[PDB]
Amino acid sequence: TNWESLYEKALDKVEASIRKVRGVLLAYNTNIDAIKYLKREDLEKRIEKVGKEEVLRYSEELPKEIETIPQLLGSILWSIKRGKAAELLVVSREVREYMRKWGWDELRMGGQVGIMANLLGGVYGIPVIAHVPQLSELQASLFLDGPIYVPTFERGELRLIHPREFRKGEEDCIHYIYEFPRNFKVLDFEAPRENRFIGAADDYNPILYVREEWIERFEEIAKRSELAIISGLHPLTQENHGKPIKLVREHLKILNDLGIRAHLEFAFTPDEVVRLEIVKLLKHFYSVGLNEVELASVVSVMGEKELAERIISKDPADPIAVIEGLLKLIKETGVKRIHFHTYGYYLALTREKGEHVRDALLFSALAAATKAMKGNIEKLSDIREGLAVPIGEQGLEVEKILEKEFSLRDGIGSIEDYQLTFIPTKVVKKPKSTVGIGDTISSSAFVSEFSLH
Ligand SMILES: Nc1ncnc2c1nc(Br)n2[C@@H]1O[C@H](COP(=O)(O)O)[C@@H](O)[C@H]1O
Ligand SMILES: Nc1ncnc2c1nc(Br)n2[C@@H]1O[C@H](COP(=O)(O)O)[C@@H](O)[C@H]1O
Numbered sequence: 495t496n497w498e499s500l501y502e503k504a505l506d507k508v509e510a511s512i513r514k515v516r517g518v519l520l521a522y523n524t525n526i527d528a529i530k531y532l533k534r535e536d537l538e539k540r541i542e543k544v545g546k547e548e549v550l551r552y553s554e555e556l557p558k559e560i561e562t563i564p565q566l567l568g569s570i571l572w573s574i575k576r577g578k579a580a581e582l583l584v585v586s587r588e589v590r591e592y593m594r595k596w597g598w599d600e601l602r603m604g605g606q607v608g609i610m611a612n613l614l615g616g617v618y619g620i621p622v623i624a625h626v627p628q629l630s631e632l633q634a635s636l637f638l639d640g641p642i643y644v645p646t647f648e649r650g651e652l653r654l655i656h657p658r659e660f661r662k663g664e665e666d667c668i669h670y671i672y673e674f675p676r677n678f679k680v681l682d683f684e685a686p687r688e689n690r691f692i693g694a695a696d697d698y699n700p701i702l703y704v705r706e707e708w709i710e711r712f713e714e715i716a717k718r719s720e721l722a723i724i725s726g727l728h729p730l731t732q733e734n735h736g737k738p739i740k741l742v743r744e745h746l747k748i749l750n751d752l753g754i755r756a757h758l759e760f761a762f763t764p765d766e767v768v769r770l771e772i773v774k775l776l777k778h779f780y781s782v783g784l785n786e787v788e789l790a791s792v793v794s795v796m797g798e799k800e801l802a803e804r805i806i807s808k809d810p811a812d813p814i815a816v817i818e819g820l821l822k823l824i825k826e827t828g829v830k831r832i833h834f835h836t837y838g839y840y841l842a843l844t845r846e847k848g849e850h851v852r853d854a855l856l857f858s859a860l861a862a863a864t865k866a867m868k869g870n871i872e873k874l875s876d877i878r879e880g881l882a883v884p885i886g887e888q889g890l891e892v893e894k895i896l897e898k899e900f901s902l903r904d905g906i907g908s909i910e911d912y913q914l915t916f917i918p919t920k921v922v923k924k925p926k927s928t929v930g931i932g933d934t935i936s937s938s939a940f941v942s943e944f945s946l947h
């Protein structure tokens with residue numbers, strides 16, 4: 495397969511079409527990300543001062559919400575050991591204070607809503623209508639210029655205004671991002687993949703706080719959009735899910751009634767009652783996006799523990815096991831589209847036939863490579879710089895497996911009445927950071943694919 499030629503042609507095709515989109519609704523979680531680039535000596539001294547044995551215990555136990563500093567350091571170590579992204583609520587004032595003093599190297603726009611708003615609106619030029627729980631001064635300052643809007647109502651009429659006008663009195667919602675590189679060393683551990691641990695320390699996003707005007711006037715807001723991306727459900731628990739999930743179903747009903755194509759961005763959802771609820775919610779979505787650990791966790795709660803294990807047991811996620819999981823998911827939910835992304839390759843399983851599915855995946859992989867290389871995408875010209883990143887060797891090896899097991903040509907084949915679409919990713923050898931690449935991938939492919947028709 496001439497993947498370099500396909501990548502170049504996909505970039506030009508999507509650039510010609512991407513601005514066609516009338517508008518994209520983004521809800522619900524926006525926050526500020528405070529990013530720390532972990533260093534071995536600093537982490538080792540913090541672990542020693544806190545109690546190494548206790549930290550290690552927490553690095554081998556299932557992460558739960560963080561109440562003590564050993565739990566925090568052990569959850570970071572949990573993520574390093576496995577090269578996996580954990581995200582836990584920091585519910586203790588003492589630990590929030592510890593993290594605040596530990597500090598951050600930079601501040602970035604955070605949350606699925608905010609990251610996709612800055613990309614789709616600030617970079618691609620598509621109008622976005624964004625739900626921001628708390629639009630503090632700092633929160634507002636992290637939005638790019640461009641057609642990014644938050645809804646307001648004046649005498650009953652909808653007015654879209656730019657978010658860099660902050661709302662006086664609303665609070666900063668801080669999430670701490672602890673980034674570590676591939677092969678990061680601490681004690682006798684070494685990270686098998688670049689990744690991060692996220693300590694979520696705000697009081698609005700964990701409960702899926704929704705602003706009153708979105709509760710009252712959702713339909714009027716949603717009419718300004720052609721597509722919707724829904725996120726933020728991952729922190730909910732069996733104890734607090736009732737009110738948020740009830741609202742989300744009401745909004746999804748309106749999106750369905752208006753014919754607005756909706757995409758659910760999955761994040762790892764530890765609470766199994768909420769995780770299964772989200773799987774049931776997918777019966778009202780057109781598209782869903784997820785990675786290898788999320789797919790496994792979903793297949794696991796659908797009664798396929800052995801298959802879930804097969805999905806996460808190999809470093810390049812076992813492509814056959816992944817596809818078996820995607821088939822089970824699309825059959826149970828009836829979604830029209832699943833976009834799977836992992837280290838080395840993406841897969842899509844879709845009702846839609848044709849090359850536009852692959853065009854969108856390749857475009858999104860160019861966006862991912864640029865984001866990995868630069869840390870943040872600032873302008874459309876950045877995406878073309880992703881063409882120089884070489885195609886990873888893992889992706890090419892996975893393609894060989896898929897061509898023996900399926901009838902595939904240039905990444906396209908059939909399973910039952912679905913199209914299977916594969917691409918190998920362009921892998922940056924030393925990325926700056928990883929937070930936000932998933933959002934960049936899922937939003938870029940979902941929106942660009944729609945724009946190609
Ligand atoms: N954020 C996260 N990412 C991946 N797996 C997670 C996770 N949080 C939890 Br809880 N897990 C769970 O951790 C298990 C994997 O643990 P090990 O990697 O120690 O085997 C998975 O079965 C998954 O359900
Ligand atoms: N160095 C790198 N170059 C290119 N893509 C990368 C990358 N590091 C990462 Br992480 N990515 C991509 O970013 C994706 C992030 O997905 P999650 O956040 O859902 O795990 C990965 O699946 C991988 O494809």
Ligand SMILES: OC[C@H]1O[C@H](O)[C@H](O)[C@@H](O)[C@@H]1O
Nearest residue numbers: 527604605606669929930933
């Ligand atoms: O995609 C990255 C985002 O994931 C989650 O929403 C986190 O809570 C947030 O802090 C981060 O910016």
